């Protein structure tokens, strides 16, 4: 049928367009199908999409006459990246095959029962297990508990059909009693197929905040309890629904933080603010800067450092994302031979490239999205942008930039490097990410938002 | 293209301008048994000769048909080739 | 292999393989070679159920001649050699 295919498409696209209005958007880019089709156990809506397919388009004028066959396919439903999704009609066996199986199976059960009767034996209940779910009466029904009563229930079908008249609420399945007919279908396979159709848990959770809560592995996540509250939903998927590839929308930095909002998403502001309160952003910044200042304190010996002094920071610099300024500054006891800039993990450095005295550090926090969650690229982008720029002030045109995603709890540093630093910053940061009280205050507080417990 | 609700594979897609095709009289005239299928009747025909291949046109315009088939031949390669020169593309006569 | 998970045969895979055959002879050779591979090497694994899928699935292919039919010659019935 052409029209019912068209109407399935309009139907689903219409309900998706209803959740899209549920925030504010029609936008395709915000809502990749992972949002809708991931089962509840991963935190997605869990709707079952039968509308993708492709729809036979053949020959409007002739198909009024011949039934030309399928000569062409109109696109059923769309996406940014295609992926694929399984569709129900594949997971439910056709009627023919079930009636055939019913006939062969009930024949076989007739025989086997005649074996139990003639030989005065009892049904092994395993010998019948092969066909256990086959047959339109669904052999299992023989063995249900209440059968002794049900044989005195007759006329159930017509009663089911006349339940239309005596009560308001419809009963979408009016053609079977699961008591007499068993259960004629199953899905759960579909579930798994969707999870791996989107690329598996590992790619799916790239969309969520799962990396921000700090939990290393999925398996131990209980959620909290089957209906997901709306706020908790928009948080959980937020780094997609809020993303920097948005078609049209107006960048607005949140009040005291560095988060950018594209357009207006209704819940995301209340949830995000209630994550960042008591000026938690500043507390994070000054926390990290302070602790790095301690680890630089202890190491004055090896690195030949006259003074490690965190400057007096203009109050706003933590959440000001345009131009930054040095937090910690450095000073040379003897003098320093630095190298050309590199990533934290780039090994080979020729330290005789440059010779300077003062170095400086920055800690630039950023709350990242699913568009760009890659830090090191962002960090080199900043550092080059500022150091090339005239405005950004630094005591010497040599320094180190330290970036952090608080959303994915990732980090990196693109600096200028002289001997002894990288072995420090690597280990030290690897502690700090698990250390600071503040970042821990996030990682608990996001867990309050998303309502997650780690069991086991 | 617009009035006939047709597209050139690279051209724009518009609205029908006559939204109702739905009315169809059941009649012998166009019946399959009475038609001979030779050539598919691609759209580019219906845009090319709109009154002929296209049954019931409305608000259609005349396409301008043909031009002389320009033979123009020029040289952008050498600046010192003369202005009048016999180009190897031409036939030898 | 997917068709054996379906728990019952479906006209789906038949019309699929049929539309796939007629397009290019490489698929002819494909289904023939896989027929020999299945019947010869791989049958010993399948339980009597999945055999109900395979039987009909090749039945639809043979009876409509797409297979083609003489490729049934591989089958040989002997008490000595049979499964």
């Amino acid at each position: 049928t052409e029209p019912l295919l068209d109407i399935l498409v309009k139907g689903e696209t219409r309900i998706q367009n209803r959740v899209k209005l549920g925030l504010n958007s029609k936008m395709p880019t915000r809502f990749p199908p992972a949002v809708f089709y991931t089962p509840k156990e991963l935190g997605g809506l869990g709707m079952i999409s039968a509308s993708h397919i492709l729809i036979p388009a053949s020959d409007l004028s002739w198909s009024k006459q011949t039934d030309t066959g399928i000569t062409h396919f109109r696109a059923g439903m769309t996406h940014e990246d295609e992926k694929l999704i399984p569709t129900i009609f594949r997971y439910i066996t056709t009627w023919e095959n079930e009636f055939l199986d019913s006939q062969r199976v009930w024949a076989e059960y007739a025989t086997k029962r005649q074996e139990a009767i003639q030989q005065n034996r009892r049904l092994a209940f395993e010998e019948l297990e092969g066909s256990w779910d086959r047959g339109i009466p669904r052999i299992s029904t023989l063995f249900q508990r209440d059968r002794h009563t049900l044989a005195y229930d007759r006329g159930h079908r017509i009663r089911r059909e006349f339940k239309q008249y005596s009560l308001e609420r419809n009963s979408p399945f009016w053609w079977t009693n699961s008591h007499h007919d068993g259960k004629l279908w199953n899905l759960n396979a579909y579930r798994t197929d969707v999870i791996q159709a989107l690329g598996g848990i590992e790619t799916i959770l790239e969309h969520t905040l799962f990396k921000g809560t700090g939990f290393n592995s999925w398996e131990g996540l209980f959620w909290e309890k089957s209906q997901i509250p709306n706020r908790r939903f928009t948080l959980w998927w937020s780094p997609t629904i809020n993303r920097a590839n948005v078609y049209v929308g107006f960048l607005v930095q949140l009040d005291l933080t560095g988060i950018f909002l594209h357009g207006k998403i209704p819940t995301l502001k209340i949830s995000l603010i209630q994550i960042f309160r008591a000026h938690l952003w500043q507390k994070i910044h000054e926390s990290i800067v302070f602790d790095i200042c301690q680890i630089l304190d202890g190491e004055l010996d090896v690195l030949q450092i006259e003074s490690v002094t965190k400057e007096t920071v203009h109050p706003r610099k933590s959440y000001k994302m345009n131009s930054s300024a040095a937090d910690i500054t450095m000073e040379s006891v003897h003098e320093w031979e630095v190298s050309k800039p590199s990533l934290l993990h780039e090994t080979n450095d020729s330290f005789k490239g440059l010779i300077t005295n003062k170095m400086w550090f920055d800690v630039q926090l950023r709350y990242g999205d699913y568009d760009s969650h890659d830090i090191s690229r962002y960090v080199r982008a900043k550092f080059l942008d500022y150091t090339t720029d005239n405005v950004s002030m630094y005591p010497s045109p040599t320094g180190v930039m330290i970036g952090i995603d608080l959303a994915y709890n990732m980090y990196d540093a693109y600096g200028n490097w002289f001997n002894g630093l990288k072995p420090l910053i690597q280990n030290s940061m690897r502690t700090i990410m698990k250390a600071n009280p503040a970042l821990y205050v996030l990682r608990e507080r996001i867990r309050k938002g998303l309502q997650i417990y780690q069991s086991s | 293209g617009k009035a006939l609700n047709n597209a050139i594979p690279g051209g724009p897609k518009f609205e029908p301008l006559y939204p109702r095709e739905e009315e169809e009289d059941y009649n012998e005239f166009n019946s399959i048994d009475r038609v001979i299928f030779r050539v598919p009747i691609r759209s580019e025909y219906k845009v090319a000769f709109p009154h002929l291949y296209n049954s019931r046109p409305r608000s259609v315009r005349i396409p301008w048909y043909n031009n002389p088939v320009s033979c123009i031949i020029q040289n952008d390669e050498e600046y010192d080739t003369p202005a009048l020169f016999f180009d190897p593309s031409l036939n030898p006569i | 292999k997917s068709s054996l998970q379906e728990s019952t045969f479906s006209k789906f895979y038949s019309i699929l393989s049929e539309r796939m055959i007629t397009f290019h002879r490489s698929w002819q050779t494909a289904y023939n070679e896989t027929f020999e591979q299945n019947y010869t090497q791989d049958i010993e694994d399948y339980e009597t159920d999945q055999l109900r899928i395979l039987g009909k699935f090749w039945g639809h292919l043979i009876s409509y001649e797409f297979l083609p039919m003489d490729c049934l010659k591989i089958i040989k019935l002997t008490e000595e050699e049979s499964c």
């Binding site: 388009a57 399928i70 109109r74 | 897609k13 095709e21 | 397009f23």
Partner: peptide
């Protein structure tokens, strides 16, 4: 080319109106 297949236009149909020949059935 639009041969008479596809939709009068893709507006209310929610799809992309993308049509493609069927490699399936030809000969």
């Amino acid at each position: 080319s639009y041969n008479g297949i596809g939709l009068k236009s893709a507006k209310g149909s929610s799809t992309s109106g993308h049509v493609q020949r069927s490699l399936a059935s030809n000969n």
